[PDB]
Design a protein around this ligand. Structure first.
Ligand SMILES: Cc1cc2nc3c(=O)[nH]c(=O)nc-3n(C[C@H](O)[C@H](O)[C@H](O)COP(=O)(O)O)c2cc1C
Ligand SMILES: O=[N+]([O-])c1ccc(O)c([N+](=O)[O-])c1
Length: 362
């Protein structure tokens, strides 16, 4: 067994390779998109994880796409996150903040001024996002057609990512994870299906990856490369966003470029919740030889699969999502081969303590 052995991850050292995947739970306070004491307790309960990767968090107000998702751009948000990271550290844990801009997977009612959300192009995501009703309960609503970002608006987006990372550092996070997957803003530019731009930010893979790489360079300069991680979902289709007709080649190009920056880790989301074709070992080898930092695998993983791939030297750690929702002490359970608590999907989004902090530890 190797899942329970130490691993150097950028600036910190994880005591095991069982990581907690980023999980949107939509329980933040509105107005303000402020993290809560309840959220602090939830993360504290899971502090034994090799590394906790937080729920997706807004780099700006414009970045918001879901009612209940937290931000890391205001003083109130920074103060609240400081208490949460302190709780995790009090229990000897490590926590990274996943930073995102939802782009077109949003709704005008939660955008600044109630205006249309932004994206690489003016194409509707054709999916749904989560808002809140008059009683504060989570509700699904069709996404609003976006406005294409103007060329001179791009530097502002890069700067928002830069500022958010500076804020993350002050908030006490150990690392930051750029959300460059699942059809959100960065992925919207990466994919030909959602990017029909004719300027230097669309067309060739070099142009499509231009934005995410400018962001990576900006955050490495703001803090340090060994504090930066990135999540990608380059193979298959995720929330209606595929990766084009040359996904494998384009993925390898992006990974080689990321490697040049010497960042802390590469987090690969292998499949959408609805499923997808499995990664071939040949592809895993091509990825492995192109990146020199930690590689995290994710997507319906079993402990057995994690051990198999870590033993073959193809990945270094595994991020579990739904199992972590239902098992705060997942590490101890997997180590002892104990049974897990059953999942209650109806409380994954919104609500309060029920289905959030009420899953017991052994
Ligand atoms: C309730 C819920 C919320 C999620 N929110 C996030 C998130 O904020 N960011 C992210 O990158 N993926 C998110 N995911 C995907 C998970 O990180 C993970 O990749 C996925 O659940 C597959 O892993 P699993 O089979 O171990 O759960 C979410 C999934 C679920 C079920
Ligand atoms: O539904 N969600 O709130 C949500 C948020 C971010 C994500 O990255 C995902 N996803 O791709 O699994 C889902």
């Amino acid at each position: 067994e190797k899942l329970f052995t130490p691993l150097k991850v950028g600036a910190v050292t994880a005591p095991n390779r069982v990581f907690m995947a980023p999980l949107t739970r939509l329980r933040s306070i509105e107005p303000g998109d402020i993290p809560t004491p309840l959220m602090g307790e939830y993360y504290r309960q899971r502090a034994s994880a090799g590394l906790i990767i937080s729920e997706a968090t807004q780099i700006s107000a414009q970045a918001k796409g879901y009612a209940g998702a937290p931000g890391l751009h205001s003083p109130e948000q920074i103060a609240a996150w400081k208490k949460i990271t302190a709780g995790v550290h009090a229990e000897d844990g490590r926590i990274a903040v996943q930073l995102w801009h939802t782009g077109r997977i949003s709704h005008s009612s939660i955008q600044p001024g109630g205006q249309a959300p932004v994206s690489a192009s003016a194409l509707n995501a054709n999916t749904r996002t989560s808002l809140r009703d008059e009683n504060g309960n989570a509700i699904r609503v069709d996404t609003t057609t976006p406005r294409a970002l103007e060329l001179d608006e791009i530097p502002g987006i890069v700067n928002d990512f830069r500022q958010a990372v500076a804020n993350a550092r002050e908030a006490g996070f150990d690392l930051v994870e750029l959300h460059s997957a699942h059809g959100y803003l960065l992925h919207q530019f990466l994919s030909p299906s959602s990017n029909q731009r004719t300027d230097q930010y669309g067309g060739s893979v070099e142009n499509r990856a231009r934005l995410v790489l400018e962001v990576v360079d900006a955050v490495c300069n703001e803090w340090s490369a060994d504090r930066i991680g990135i999540r990608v979902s380059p193979i298959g289709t995720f929330q209606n966003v595929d990766n084009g007709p040359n996904e494998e080649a384009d993925a390898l190009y992006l990974i080689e470029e990321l490697a040049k920056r010497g960042i802390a880790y590469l987090h690969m989301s292998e499949t959408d919740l609805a499923g997808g074709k499995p990664y071939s070992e040949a592809f895993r080898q091509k990825v492995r030889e192109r990146f020199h930092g930690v590689i995290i695998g994710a997507g319906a993983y079993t402990a057995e699969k994690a051990e198999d791939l870590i033993g073959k030297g193809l990945i270094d750690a595994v991020a579990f999502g739904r199992d972590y929702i239902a098992n705060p002490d997942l590490v101890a359970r997997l180590q002892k081969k104990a049974e897990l608590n059953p999942q209650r999907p109806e409380s994954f989004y919104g609500g309060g303590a029920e289905g959030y902090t009420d899953y017991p530890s052994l």
